[model samples]
Target: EPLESQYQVGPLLGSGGFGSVYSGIRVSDNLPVAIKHVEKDRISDWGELPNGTRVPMEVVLLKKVSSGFSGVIRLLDWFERPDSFVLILERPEPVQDLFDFITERGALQEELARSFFWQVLEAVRHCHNCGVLHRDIKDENILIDLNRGELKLIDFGSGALLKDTVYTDFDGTRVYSPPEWIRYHRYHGRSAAVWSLGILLYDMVCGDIPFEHDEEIIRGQVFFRQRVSSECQHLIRWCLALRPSDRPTFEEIQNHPWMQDVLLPQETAEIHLHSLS
Candidate 1:
Protein backbone atom coordinates (compact mmCIF):
# COMPACT_ATOMS: atom_id res chain seq x y z
CA GLU A 1 0.00 0.00 0.00
CA PRO A 2 1.09 3.57 -0.61
CA LEU A 3 2.34 5.57 2.41
CA GLU A 4 -0.45 8.13 2.04
CA SER A 5 -3.06 5.37 2.25
CA GLN A 6 -1.62 3.78 5.41
CA TYR A 7 -0.29 6.83 7.26
CA GLN A 8 -1.35 10.40 7.86
CA VAL A 9 1.58 12.73 7.59
CA GLY A 10 1.64 15.69 9.93
CA PRO A 11 3.73 18.78 10.44
CA LEU A 12 7.42 18.81 9.64
CA LEU A 13 9.66 17.58 12.41
CA GLY A 14 12.86 18.68 10.73
CA SER A 15 14.71 19.12 7.42
CA GLY A 16 18.31 18.95 6.26
CA GLY A 17 20.50 18.65 3.20
CA PHE A 18 19.53 14.99 2.82
CA GLY A 19 15.75 15.40 3.12
CA SER A 20 12.94 16.15 5.55
CA VAL A 21 11.09 14.35 8.31
CA TYR A 22 7.46 14.88 9.27
CA SER A 23 5.43 13.72 12.20
CA GLY A 24 3.00 11.02 11.12
CA ILE A 25 0.48 8.50 12.38
CA ARG A 26 -0.26 4.95 11.29
CA VAL A 27 -3.90 4.99 10.22
CA SER A 28 -4.67 1.40 11.19
CA ASP A 29 -3.50 1.53 14.81
CA ASN A 30 -2.90 5.25 15.23
CA LEU A 31 0.69 4.54 16.06
CA PRO A 32 2.94 7.58 16.18
CA VAL A 33 5.55 7.52 13.43
CA ALA A 34 8.17 9.76 11.87
CA ILE A 35 7.75 10.05 8.14
CA LYS A 36 11.01 10.65 6.31
CA HIS A 37 11.15 11.79 2.70
CA VAL A 38 14.46 11.33 0.91
CA GLU A 39 15.11 12.51 -2.60
CA LYS A 40 16.35 9.55 -4.65
CA ASP A 41 19.13 11.63 -6.15
CA ARG A 42 20.42 12.45 -2.68
CA ILE A 43 20.89 8.84 -1.65
CA SER A 44 24.63 8.19 -1.38
CA ASP A 45 24.36 4.48 -1.92
CA TRP A 46 22.03 1.48 -2.24
CA GLY A 47 22.01 -2.11 -1.00
CA GLU A 48 20.36 -5.33 -2.03
CA LEU A 49 18.34 -7.56 0.29
CA PRO A 50 18.77 -11.32 0.11
CA ASN A 51 15.63 -11.44 -2.00
CA GLY A 52 17.41 -9.42 -4.73
CA THR A 53 15.34 -6.29 -4.05
CA ARG A 54 17.59 -3.25 -3.97
CA VAL A 55 16.82 -0.41 -1.54
CA PRO A 56 18.52 2.56 0.02
CA MET A 57 21.45 1.77 2.32
CA GLU A 58 19.63 3.36 5.24
CA VAL A 59 16.67 1.03 4.87
CA VAL A 60 18.92 -2.00 4.59
CA LEU A 61 20.88 -1.03 7.70
CA LEU A 62 17.69 -0.26 9.63
CA LYS A 63 16.24 -3.66 8.80
CA LYS A 64 19.41 -5.45 9.83
CA VAL A 65 19.53 -3.66 13.19
CA SER A 66 15.80 -3.94 13.94
CA SER A 67 15.91 -6.55 16.69
CA GLY A 68 13.28 -4.98 18.94
CA PHE A 69 16.00 -3.13 20.89
CA SER A 70 14.59 -0.14 22.71
CA GLY A 71 17.81 1.74 22.01
CA VAL A 72 17.35 1.78 18.22
CA ILE A 73 14.50 3.29 16.27
CA ARG A 74 12.46 0.81 14.25
CA LEU A 75 11.42 1.33 10.64
CA LEU A 76 7.80 0.26 10.30
CA ASP A 77 7.37 0.60 6.53
CA TRP A 78 8.80 2.21 3.42
CA PHE A 79 7.54 3.27 0.02
CA GLU A 80 8.98 4.50 -3.26
CA ARG A 81 7.78 7.47 -5.23
CA PRO A 82 8.85 8.94 -8.53
CA ASP A 83 11.18 11.50 -7.02
CA SER A 84 11.64 10.37 -3.42
CA PHE A 85 11.34 7.53 -0.91
CA VAL A 86 9.21 7.52 2.22
CA LEU A 87 10.19 5.77 5.44
CA ILE A 88 7.78 5.26 8.34
CA LEU A 89 9.66 5.07 11.63
CA GLU A 90 8.70 4.62 15.26
CA ARG A 91 8.15 7.98 16.95
CA PRO A 92 8.23 7.88 20.72
CA GLU A 93 6.23 10.65 22.34
CA PRO A 94 7.22 13.08 25.09
CA VAL A 95 10.80 13.03 23.98
CA GLN A 96 13.49 15.50 22.98
CA ASP A 97 16.53 15.10 20.82
CA LEU A 98 19.67 15.01 22.93
CA PHE A 99 21.06 18.09 21.19
CA ASP A 100 18.16 20.30 22.26
CA PHE A 101 17.94 18.61 25.62
CA ILE A 102 21.53 19.55 26.36
CA THR A 103 21.17 23.05 24.92
CA GLU A 104 18.28 23.84 27.27
CA ARG A 105 19.55 22.10 30.38
CA GLY A 106 23.25 22.72 29.84
CA ALA A 107 25.75 19.97 30.51
CA LEU A 108 24.28 17.03 32.33
CA GLN A 109 25.44 15.71 35.68
CA GLU A 110 27.98 12.90 35.48
CA GLU A 111 25.48 10.25 36.60
CA LEU A 112 22.86 11.42 34.12
CA ALA A 113 25.43 11.59 31.34
CA ARG A 114 26.53 8.08 32.22
CA SER A 115 22.99 6.80 31.80
CA PHE A 116 22.62 8.27 28.34
CA PHE A 117 26.11 7.20 27.32
CA TRP A 118 25.53 3.62 28.37
CA GLN A 119 22.31 3.42 26.41
CA VAL A 120 23.96 4.86 23.32
CA LEU A 121 26.88 2.47 23.67
CA GLU A 122 24.51 -0.47 23.93
CA ALA A 123 22.65 0.68 20.85
CA VAL A 124 25.88 1.04 18.90
CA ARG A 125 27.08 -2.34 20.10
CA HIS A 126 23.79 -3.84 18.94
CA CYS A 127 24.34 -2.38 15.52
CA HIS A 128 27.88 -3.82 15.44
CA ASN A 129 26.61 -7.23 16.49
CA CYS A 130 24.09 -7.10 13.67
CA GLY A 131 26.91 -6.39 11.19
CA VAL A 132 25.89 -2.75 10.69
CA LEU A 133 27.67 0.49 11.41
CA HIS A 134 25.74 3.63 12.37
CA ARG A 135 28.54 5.83 11.03
CA ASP A 136 26.90 8.89 12.53
CA ILE A 137 26.57 8.80 16.31
CA LYS A 138 25.81 12.21 17.73
CA ASP A 139 23.38 14.08 19.99
CA GLU A 140 21.23 15.11 17.01
CA ASN A 141 20.64 11.47 16.12
CA ILE A 142 19.58 10.46 19.62
CA LEU A 143 16.12 10.97 21.12
CA ILE A 144 15.68 10.92 24.87
CA ASP A 145 12.44 10.04 26.64
CA LEU A 146 12.31 12.62 29.41
CA ASN A 147 10.21 10.66 31.86
CA ARG A 148 11.69 7.23 31.34
CA GLY A 149 15.28 8.53 30.96
CA GLU A 150 15.70 6.22 27.98
CA LEU A 151 17.33 7.02 24.64
CA LYS A 152 16.79 5.76 21.12
CA LEU A 153 19.34 6.09 18.33
CA ILE A 154 17.74 7.48 15.20
CA ASP A 155 18.75 8.37 11.61
CA PHE A 156 20.64 5.64 9.87
CA GLY A 157 21.20 7.65 6.72
CA SER A 158 24.98 7.47 7.19
CA GLY A 159 24.99 3.80 8.10
CA ALA A 160 26.99 1.05 6.37
CA LEU A 161 27.56 -2.66 6.62
CA LEU A 162 30.20 -3.53 9.22
CA LYS A 163 33.49 -4.78 7.87
CA ASP A 164 37.03 -5.37 9.05
CA THR A 165 38.67 -3.35 6.31
CA VAL A 166 39.71 0.27 6.21
CA TYR A 167 37.04 2.75 5.03
CA THR A 168 38.30 5.53 2.78
CA ASP A 169 35.07 7.44 2.37
CA PHE A 170 33.15 9.33 5.05
CA ASP A 171 29.47 10.24 5.41
CA GLY A 172 29.03 11.16 9.08
CA THR A 173 29.01 14.52 10.84
CA ARG A 174 32.29 16.36 10.51
CA VAL A 175 32.70 17.24 14.17
CA TYR A 176 32.44 13.61 15.16
CA SER A 177 34.98 12.37 12.64
CA PRO A 178 38.18 10.88 14.01
CA PRO A 179 41.58 12.49 13.57
CA GLU A 180 42.70 9.58 11.47
CA TRP A 181 39.92 10.19 8.98
CA ILE A 182 40.79 13.86 8.83
CA ARG A 183 44.54 13.26 8.47
CA TYR A 184 44.75 10.11 6.38
CA HIS A 185 41.29 9.97 4.80
CA ARG A 186 40.89 6.36 5.96
CA TYR A 187 39.82 4.56 9.13
CA HIS A 188 38.62 1.19 10.32
CA GLY A 189 34.98 0.80 11.32
CA ARG A 190 35.43 -0.16 14.96
CA SER A 191 38.08 2.41 15.80
CA ALA A 192 36.29 5.23 13.98
CA ALA A 193 33.07 4.36 15.82
CA VAL A 194 34.87 4.43 19.15
CA TRP A 195 36.22 7.88 18.32
CA SER A 196 32.73 9.17 17.60
CA LEU A 197 31.57 7.70 20.91
CA GLY A 198 34.24 9.74 22.66
CA ILE A 199 33.06 12.91 20.94
CA LEU A 200 29.47 12.08 21.92
CA LEU A 201 30.37 11.58 25.58
CA TYR A 202 32.35 14.81 25.71
CA ASP A 203 29.42 16.70 24.19
CA MET A 204 27.10 15.19 26.79
CA VAL A 205 29.02 16.53 29.77
CA CYS A 206 31.09 19.40 28.34
CA GLY A 207 28.18 21.36 26.81
CA ASP A 208 30.15 21.19 23.55
CA ILE A 209 32.56 19.06 21.58
CA PRO A 210 36.27 19.19 22.34
CA PHE A 211 37.35 20.19 18.86
CA GLU A 212 35.72 22.75 16.58
CA HIS A 213 37.92 22.56 13.49
CA ASP A 214 40.10 20.20 11.49
CA GLU A 215 43.28 21.68 12.97
CA GLU A 216 41.94 21.19 16.50
CA ILE A 217 40.96 17.60 15.75
CA ILE A 218 44.36 16.88 14.24
CA ARG A 219 46.10 18.33 17.29
CA GLY A 220 44.03 15.92 19.40
CA GLN A 221 44.03 18.01 22.53
CA VAL A 222 40.96 18.04 24.80
CA PHE A 223 40.20 20.68 27.36
CA PHE A 224 37.36 20.15 29.81
CA ARG A 225 35.45 23.41 30.10
CA GLN A 226 33.14 21.93 32.69
CA ARG A 227 34.43 20.05 35.68
CA VAL A 228 33.85 16.44 34.76
CA SER A 229 34.90 13.40 36.76
CA SER A 230 38.46 12.26 36.17
CA GLU A 231 37.41 8.78 35.18
CA CYS A 232 34.95 10.20 32.69
CA GLN A 233 37.66 12.39 31.27
CA HIS A 234 39.98 9.43 31.09
CA LEU A 235 37.44 7.42 29.12
CA ILE A 236 36.80 10.27 26.77
CA ARG A 237 40.49 10.67 26.12
CA TRP A 238 40.79 6.94 25.56
CA CYS A 239 38.03 6.99 22.99
CA LEU A 240 39.35 10.09 21.30
CA ALA A 241 42.87 8.80 21.11
CA LEU A 242 44.66 10.58 18.25
CA ARG A 243 45.74 7.19 17.05
CA PRO A 244 42.89 4.77 16.40
CA SER A 245 45.02 1.92 17.75
CA ASP A 246 45.18 3.71 21.09
CA ARG A 247 41.40 3.76 21.44
CA PRO A 248 39.58 1.17 23.53
CA THR A 249 37.26 -1.41 22.07
CA PHE A 250 33.54 -1.62 22.84
CA GLU A 251 34.20 -4.24 25.54
CA GLU A 252 36.75 -2.03 27.24
CA ILE A 253 34.41 0.98 27.05
CA GLN A 254 31.56 -0.97 28.69
CA ASN A 255 33.86 -1.80 31.56
CA HIS A 256 35.28 1.70 32.00
CA PRO A 257 35.22 3.17 35.49
CA TRP A 258 32.80 5.95 34.61
CA MET A 259 30.53 3.67 32.64
CA GLN A 260 30.35 1.41 35.70
CA ASP A 261 28.28 4.10 37.45
CA VAL A 262 25.37 3.75 35.04
CA LEU A 263 22.11 2.55 36.53
CA LEU A 264 20.68 -0.88 35.89
CA PRO A 265 17.24 -1.27 34.35
CA GLN A 266 15.60 -1.82 37.73
CA GLU A 267 17.53 1.05 39.31
CA THR A 268 16.52 3.36 36.50
CA ALA A 269 12.87 2.44 37.05
CA GLU A 270 13.19 3.04 40.78
CA ILE A 271 14.67 6.46 40.18
CA HIS A 272 11.85 7.31 37.78
CA LEU A 273 9.25 6.28 40.32
CA HIS A 274 10.95 8.25 43.05
CA SER A 275 11.05 11.33 40.86
CA LEU A 276 7.25 11.16 40.62
CA SER A 277 6.70 10.85 44.33
Candidate 2:
Protein backbone atom coordinates (compact mmCIF):
# COMPACT_ATOMS: atom_id res chain seq x y z
CA GLU A 1 0.00 0.00 0.00
CA PRO A 2 1.09 3.63 -0.50
CA LEU A 3 1.03 4.32 3.25
CA GLU A 4 3.36 1.39 4.02
CA SER A 5 5.89 2.61 1.45
CA GLN A 6 6.63 5.83 3.38
CA TYR A 7 8.93 4.01 5.80
CA GLN A 8 12.04 1.84 5.55
CA VAL A 9 10.78 -1.07 7.60
CA GLY A 10 13.12 -3.44 9.44
CA PRO A 11 12.73 -6.52 11.64
CA LEU A 12 9.56 -7.29 13.57
CA LEU A 13 9.51 -5.89 17.11
CA GLY A 14 6.45 -7.74 18.43
CA SER A 15 3.10 -9.30 17.49
CA GLY A 16 -0.29 -9.86 19.06
CA GLY A 17 -3.72 -11.03 18.01
CA PHE A 18 -4.73 -7.57 16.79
CA GLY A 19 -1.47 -6.20 15.38
CA SER A 20 2.23 -6.60 14.71
CA VAL A 21 4.88 -4.01 15.53
CA TYR A 22 7.91 -3.50 13.29
CA SER A 23 11.09 -1.50 13.66
CA GLY A 24 11.30 1.19 11.03
CA ILE A 25 12.82 4.57 10.22
CA ARG A 26 10.68 7.26 8.68
CA VAL A 27 11.91 7.94 5.14
CA SER A 28 11.50 11.70 5.24
CA ASP A 29 13.11 12.34 8.63
CA ASN A 30 15.19 9.12 9.04
CA LEU A 31 14.15 8.78 12.65
CA PRO A 32 13.40 5.49 14.44
CA VAL A 33 9.72 4.54 14.64
CA ALA A 34 7.69 1.56 15.70
CA ILE A 35 5.15 0.80 13.00
CA LYS A 36 2.13 -1.10 14.21
CA HIS A 37 -0.23 -2.64 11.66
CA VAL A 38 -3.53 -3.54 13.27
CA GLU A 39 -6.28 -5.59 11.70
CA LYS A 40 -9.37 -3.37 11.83
CA ASP A 41 -11.85 -6.05 12.90
CA ARG A 42 -9.84 -6.85 16.00
CA ILE A 43 -10.71 -3.56 17.67
CA SER A 44 -14.06 -3.51 19.46
CA ASP A 45 -15.77 -0.14 19.97
CA TRP A 46 -13.51 1.15 17.18
CA GLY A 47 -14.33 4.59 15.85
CA GLU A 48 -15.35 5.48 12.32
CA LEU A 49 -15.16 8.45 10.00
CA PRO A 50 -18.11 9.90 8.12
CA ASN A 51 -17.04 7.79 5.14
CA GLY A 52 -17.38 4.66 7.40
CA THR A 53 -13.77 3.58 7.86
CA ARG A 54 -12.77 2.24 11.27
CA VAL A 55 -9.83 3.30 13.51
CA PRO A 56 -8.25 1.73 16.53
CA MET A 57 -9.22 3.08 19.96
CA GLU A 58 -5.52 3.14 20.86
CA VAL A 59 -4.78 5.79 18.24
CA VAL A 60 -7.51 8.01 19.68
CA LEU A 61 -6.24 7.53 23.25
CA LEU A 62 -2.57 8.14 22.43
CA LYS A 63 -3.40 11.40 20.72
CA LYS A 64 -4.87 12.71 23.99
CA VAL A 65 -1.44 12.88 25.68
CA SER A 66 0.90 12.90 22.68
CA SER A 67 2.11 16.45 23.14
CA GLY A 68 5.50 15.80 24.80
CA PHE A 69 4.29 13.89 27.84
CA SER A 70 7.52 12.37 29.15
CA GLY A 71 5.97 9.35 30.88
CA VAL A 72 3.61 8.39 28.05
CA ILE A 73 4.40 7.07 24.58
CA ARG A 74 4.06 9.50 21.71
CA LEU A 75 2.18 8.76 18.51
CA LEU A 76 4.00 10.35 15.59
CA ASP A 77 1.52 9.65 12.79
CA TRP A 78 -0.79 7.03 11.33
CA PHE A 79 -2.35 5.75 8.12
CA GLU A 80 -5.77 4.27 7.50
CA ARG A 81 -5.92 1.63 4.81
CA PRO A 82 -8.87 -0.46 3.66
CA ASP A 83 -7.60 -3.70 5.25
CA SER A 84 -5.82 -2.40 8.33
CA PHE A 85 -4.72 0.72 10.22
CA VAL A 86 -1.06 1.53 10.79
CA LEU A 87 0.36 3.64 13.59
CA ILE A 88 3.83 5.18 13.56
CA LEU A 89 5.11 5.51 17.11
CA GLU A 90 8.30 6.84 18.71
CA ARG A 91 10.79 4.04 19.25
CA PRO A 92 13.14 5.15 21.97
CA GLU A 93 16.62 3.70 21.61
CA PRO A 94 18.01 1.51 24.42
CA VAL A 95 14.69 0.56 25.97
CA GLN A 96 13.17 -2.66 27.31
CA ASP A 97 9.72 -3.48 28.65
CA LEU A 98 9.61 -3.64 32.43
CA PHE A 99 9.07 -7.41 32.40
CA ASP A 100 12.44 -8.08 30.77
CA PHE A 101 14.21 -5.45 32.86
CA ILE A 102 12.88 -6.95 36.10
CA THR A 103 13.73 -10.45 34.92
CA GLU A 104 17.36 -9.48 34.39
CA ARG A 105 17.73 -7.49 37.61
CA GLY A 106 15.58 -9.73 39.87
CA ALA A 107 14.38 -6.69 41.85
CA LEU A 108 15.27 -3.03 41.80
CA GLN A 109 16.87 -1.34 44.81
CA GLU A 110 14.31 0.74 46.70
CA GLU A 111 15.98 4.02 45.75
CA LEU A 112 16.11 3.14 42.06
CA ALA A 113 12.61 1.73 42.18
CA ARG A 114 11.50 5.03 43.66
CA SER A 115 13.03 6.89 40.75
CA PHE A 116 11.17 4.88 38.12
CA PHE A 117 7.83 4.50 39.94
CA TRP A 118 7.60 8.24 40.43
CA GLN A 119 7.47 8.49 36.65
CA VAL A 120 4.77 5.82 36.40
CA LEU A 121 2.59 7.74 38.83
CA GLU A 122 3.27 10.95 36.92
CA ALA A 123 2.26 9.22 33.72
CA VAL A 124 -1.02 8.09 35.28
CA ARG A 125 -1.70 11.55 36.67
CA HIS A 126 -1.04 13.13 33.29
CA CYS A 127 -3.43 10.72 31.63
CA HIS A 128 -6.11 11.51 34.21
CA ASN A 129 -5.48 15.23 33.80
CA CYS A 130 -5.98 14.78 30.07
CA GLY A 131 -9.34 13.02 30.72
CA VAL A 132 -8.05 9.52 30.14
CA LEU A 133 -8.17 6.41 32.30
CA HIS A 134 -5.55 3.76 31.62
CA ARG A 135 -7.41 0.64 32.69
CA ASP A 136 -4.32 -1.48 32.31
CA ILE A 137 -1.19 -0.55 34.22
CA LYS A 138 1.16 -3.50 34.28
CA ASP A 139 4.82 -4.39 33.78
CA GLU A 140 4.25 -5.59 30.22
CA ASN A 141 2.62 -2.30 29.20
CA ILE A 142 5.42 -0.10 30.59
CA LEU A 143 8.83 0.36 28.98
CA ILE A 144 11.99 1.28 30.81
CA ASP A 145 14.92 3.13 29.29
CA LEU A 146 17.64 0.98 30.82
CA ASN A 147 20.46 3.46 30.33
CA ARG A 148 18.52 6.45 31.63
CA GLY A 149 16.18 4.78 34.16
CA GLU A 150 13.11 6.41 32.61
CA LEU A 151 9.62 4.93 32.24
CA LYS A 152 6.92 5.29 29.56
CA LEU A 153 3.41 3.89 29.65
CA ILE A 154 2.28 2.19 26.46
CA ASP A 155 -0.64 0.16 25.00
CA PHE A 156 -3.59 2.52 25.23
CA GLY A 157 -6.12 0.15 23.65
CA SER A 158 -7.40 -0.67 27.12
CA GLY A 159 -7.93 2.96 28.11
CA ALA A 160 -11.08 5.09 28.27
CA LEU A 161 -11.88 8.75 28.71
CA LEU A 162 -12.87 9.73 32.23
CA LYS A 163 -16.55 10.59 32.49
CA ASP A 164 -19.36 10.82 34.99
CA THR A 165 -19.76 7.06 35.23
CA VAL A 166 -18.51 3.73 36.47
CA TYR A 167 -17.24 0.92 34.23
CA THR A 168 -18.99 -2.45 34.05
CA ASP A 169 -16.73 -4.31 31.68
CA PHE A 170 -13.01 -4.74 32.36
CA ASP A 171 -10.62 -4.84 29.42
CA GLY A 172 -7.45 -5.25 31.44
CA THR A 173 -5.77 -8.31 32.91
CA ARG A 174 -7.75 -10.09 35.63
CA VAL A 175 -4.72 -10.09 37.94
CA TYR A 176 -4.80 -6.32 38.24
CA SER A 177 -8.54 -5.93 38.77
CA PRO A 178 -9.82 -4.25 41.89
CA PRO A 179 -11.75 -6.15 44.56
CA GLU A 180 -15.12 -4.73 43.51
CA TRP A 181 -14.71 -6.01 39.97
CA ILE A 182 -12.98 -9.19 41.01
CA ARG A 183 -15.89 -10.00 43.28
CA TYR A 184 -18.83 -8.38 41.49
CA HIS A 185 -17.76 -7.43 37.96
CA ARG A 186 -18.25 -3.70 38.55
CA TYR A 187 -15.82 -0.89 39.42
CA HIS A 188 -14.96 2.76 38.98
CA GLY A 189 -12.12 3.42 36.56
CA ARG A 190 -10.04 5.66 38.82
CA SER A 191 -10.01 3.49 41.93
CA ALA A 192 -9.42 0.34 39.91
CA ALA A 193 -6.43 2.04 38.31
CA VAL A 194 -5.02 2.77 41.73
CA TRP A 195 -5.23 -0.93 42.56
CA SER A 196 -3.17 -1.81 39.51
CA LEU A 197 -0.56 0.70 40.60
CA GLY A 198 -0.19 -1.21 43.86
CA ILE A 199 0.31 -4.45 42.00
CA LEU A 200 2.83 -2.78 39.67
CA LEU A 201 4.82 -1.44 42.60
CA TYR A 202 4.88 -4.91 44.13
CA ASP A 203 6.19 -6.37 40.90
CA MET A 204 8.93 -3.75 40.70
CA VAL A 205 10.18 -4.29 44.25
CA CYS A 206 9.43 -8.00 44.75
CA GLY A 207 9.99 -9.20 41.18
CA ASP A 208 6.64 -11.02 41.28
CA ILE A 209 2.96 -10.33 41.85
CA PRO A 210 2.02 -10.67 45.48
CA PHE A 211 -1.34 -12.32 44.91
CA GLU A 212 -2.06 -15.14 42.50
CA HIS A 213 -5.81 -15.56 43.04
CA ASP A 214 -8.87 -13.32 43.08
CA GLU A 215 -9.58 -14.20 46.67
CA GLU A 216 -6.00 -13.41 47.65
CA ILE A 217 -6.20 -9.89 46.31
CA ILE A 218 -9.65 -9.44 47.79
CA ARG A 219 -8.25 -10.40 51.16
CA GLY A 220 -5.39 -7.93 50.70
CA GLN A 221 -2.69 -10.38 51.77
CA VAL A 222 0.74 -8.98 51.00
CA PHE A 223 4.25 -9.74 52.19
CA PHE A 224 7.59 -8.39 51.01
CA ARG A 225 10.89 -10.14 50.41
CA GLN A 226 13.00 -7.28 49.00
CA ARG A 227 12.55 -4.98 51.99
CA VAL A 228 11.24 -1.64 50.72
CA SER A 229 10.92 1.15 53.29
CA SER A 230 7.84 1.47 55.49
CA GLU A 231 6.59 4.51 53.60
CA CYS A 232 6.41 2.47 50.43
CA GLN A 233 4.80 -0.30 52.39
CA HIS A 234 2.23 2.18 53.57
CA LEU A 235 1.57 3.48 50.07
CA ILE A 236 0.99 0.02 48.67
CA ARG A 237 -1.40 -0.77 51.47
CA TRP A 238 -3.24 2.45 50.79
CA CYS A 239 -3.60 1.60 47.13
CA LEU A 240 -4.51 -2.03 47.73
CA ALA A 241 -7.22 -1.36 50.25
CA LEU A 242 -10.33 -3.30 49.25
CA ARG A 243 -12.64 -0.40 50.02
CA PRO A 244 -12.43 1.91 47.01
CA SER A 245 -13.16 4.95 49.12
CA ASP A 246 -10.25 4.11 51.44
CA ARG A 247 -7.66 4.20 48.66
CA PRO A 248 -5.68 7.40 48.53
CA THR A 249 -6.53 9.83 45.74
CA PHE A 250 -3.93 10.46 43.04
CA GLU A 251 -3.16 13.81 44.69
CA GLU A 252 -2.44 12.17 48.03
CA ILE A 253 -0.28 9.57 46.35
CA GLN A 254 1.82 12.30 44.77
CA ASN A 255 2.37 14.02 48.09
CA HIS A 256 3.25 10.79 49.88
CA PRO A 257 6.76 10.54 51.33
CA TRP A 258 7.57 7.42 49.30
CA MET A 259 7.40 9.42 46.11
CA GLN A 260 9.72 12.01 47.66
CA ASP A 261 12.44 9.37 48.17
CA VAL A 262 13.26 9.62 44.49
CA LEU A 263 16.67 11.06 43.70
CA LEU A 264 17.14 13.76 41.11
CA PRO A 265 18.86 12.56 37.94
CA GLN A 266 22.06 14.45 38.71
CA GLU A 267 22.23 13.02 42.22
CA THR A 268 21.85 9.50 40.89
CA ALA A 269 24.44 10.26 38.22
CA GLU A 270 26.89 11.38 40.90
CA ILE A 271 26.25 8.19 42.86
CA HIS A 272 27.00 6.16 39.75
CA LEU A 273 30.27 8.05 39.22
CA HIS A 274 31.28 7.42 42.85
CA SER A 275 30.68 3.69 42.53
CA LEU A 276 33.14 3.60 39.60
CA SER A 277 35.86 5.11 41.80
The candidate that wins on lDDT is: 1
Residue ranges of candidate 1 with Cα displaced over 4 Å: 15-18, 265-277
Residue-level lDDT of model 1, residues 1-277, one tens digit each, is: 7568888889999843446999999898999999988888889989987687778999999989886888899988788889888888999887789898788878887877888899999999999999999999999999976666678999899999999999999988998999989999999999999999999999999988889899999998999999998999999999999988999999999998788868864466356423653
Whole-structure CA lDDT of model 2: 0.81
TM-score against truth, every candidate: 0.95, 0.91
Residue-level lDDT for 88 in candidate 2: 88
Tell me, what's the RMSD of every candidate?
2.0, 2.8
8-81 in candidate 2: lDDT tens per residue?
99999874343489999988888888898877677765644335545677777788778987788899888987
Local distance difference test, each candidate: 0.88, 0.81
Top candidate on TM-score is 1
Worst 10 residues of 2 by lDDT: 268-277
> Which residue pairs of candidate 1 clash?
none
